[PDB]
Amino acid sequence: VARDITLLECVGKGRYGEVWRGSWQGENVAVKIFSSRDEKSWFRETELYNTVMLRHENILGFIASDMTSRHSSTQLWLITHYHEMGSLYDYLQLTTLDTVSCLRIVLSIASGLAHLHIEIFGTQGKPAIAHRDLKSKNILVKKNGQCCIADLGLAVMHSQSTNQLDVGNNPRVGTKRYMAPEVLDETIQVDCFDSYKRVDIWAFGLVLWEVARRMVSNGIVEDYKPPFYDVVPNDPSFEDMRKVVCVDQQRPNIPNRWFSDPTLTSLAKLMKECWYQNPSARLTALRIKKTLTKI
Numbered sequence: 001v002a003r004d005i006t007l008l009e010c011v012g013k014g015r016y017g018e019v020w021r022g023s024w025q026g027e028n029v030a031v032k033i034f035s036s037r038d039e040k041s042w043f044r045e046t047e048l049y050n051t052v053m054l055r056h057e058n059i060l061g062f063i064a065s066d067m068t069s070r071h072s073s074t075q076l077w078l079i080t081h082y083h084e085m086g087s088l089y090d091y092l093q094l095t096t097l098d099t100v101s102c103l104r105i106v107l108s109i110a111s112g113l114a115h116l117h118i119e120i121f122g123t124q125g126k127p128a129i130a131h132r133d134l135k136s137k138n139i140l141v142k143k144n145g146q147c148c149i150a151d152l153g154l155a156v157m158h159s160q161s162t163n164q165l166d167v168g169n170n171p172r173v174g175t176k177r178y179m180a181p182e183v184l185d186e187t188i189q190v191d192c193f194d195s196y197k198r199v200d201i202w203a204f205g206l207v208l209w210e211v212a213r214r215m216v217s218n219g220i221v222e223d224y225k226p227p228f229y230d231v232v233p234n235d236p237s238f239e240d241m242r243k244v245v246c247v248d249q250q251r252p253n254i255p256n257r258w259f260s261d262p263t264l265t266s267l268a269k270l271m272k273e274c275w276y277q278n279p280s281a282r283l284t285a286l287r288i289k290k291t292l293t294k295i
């Protein structure tokens with residue numbers, strides 16, 4: 001209930017709204033107050049968390065959804081577990097990673113994504129879900145070293161038996177920096193659920209690139225950089241990414257030092273298998289989880 005939560009400090013702000021660190025029965029919680037322009041994302045997330053009952057150790061822990069009316073308006077709240085280490089985008093800028101730390105991050109993200117993509121059968125079984133806005137800022141680092149995926153506002157679901165696709169009704173567009181080439185060229189088949197899984201794998205390979213750069217190998221480490229930092233400006237436009245990803249067919253550069261570390265070699269091969277211009281040639285989330293497990 002929103003009445004029992006004490007908003008203590010704002011840890012994030014954007015077009016989506018605000019994220020607050022709050023107290024609730026003597027424990028820290030995360031409260032997202034949605035903006036009026038992003039109401040459809042609150043409905044979709046409430047559906048995925050309350051109706052679909054999405055629950056996984058590598059997905060942001062749902063607590064409660066609520067609506068509070070004040071100042072002649074009604075705010076839409078989402079209350080989840082609070083991770084004091086912040087987003088993966090924040091965490092990668094404060095520390096370097098070793099082999100275990102890197103693999104724990106990338107395997108946890110892969111297992112959480114595979115849980116979204118894999119349909120659980122039986123009655124009231126979880127359908128296959130695509131995130132469609134996967135990025136380092138939508139990934140949070142837990143104190144055990146593992147990560148969890150957040151923001152289900154753009155989720156899309158599908159069930160194999162009925163062959164029915166639920167795209168929702170959200171005017172929100174995904175993050176342009178992480179957009180797949182089929183999205184930028186407007187060739188993506190919006191009626192096929194596999195299309196939405198393949199744009200997640202594409203974006204997953206970009207987060208994979210961000211994390212691998214922070215793994216120290218032979219006293220060498222790369223500074224943190226967002227994908228395509230050296231070709232697009234801040235807040236890139238649609239034409240900015242299309243020129244890089246589609247026209248020039250550019251991908252993030254694999255540092256040569258990665259070939260001197262066996263873990264980074266298998267990781268560099270993994271992200272390359274997520275960046276195919278042909279969406280059907282990209283790996284599945286299950287194959288990525290399997291490949292990461294054998295490493």
Ligand SMILES: COc1cc(-c2cncc3c2CCOc2cc(N4CCNCC4)ccc2-3)cc(OC)c1OC
Nearest residue numbers: 011012019030031032078080082083086087138150151
């Ligand atoms: C409640 O709904 C959400 C909460 C969080 C969340 C959860 N737990 C911690 C944080 C966040 C938001 C962003 O990251 C943080 C960052 C910081 N700090 C570092 C940078 N600046 C100083 C403060 C502190 C806490 C968090 C995420 C969501 O999706 C991106 C949410 O919606 C689905």
Ligand SMILES: [N+]
Nearest residue numbers: 012087090137
């Ligand atoms: N952040």
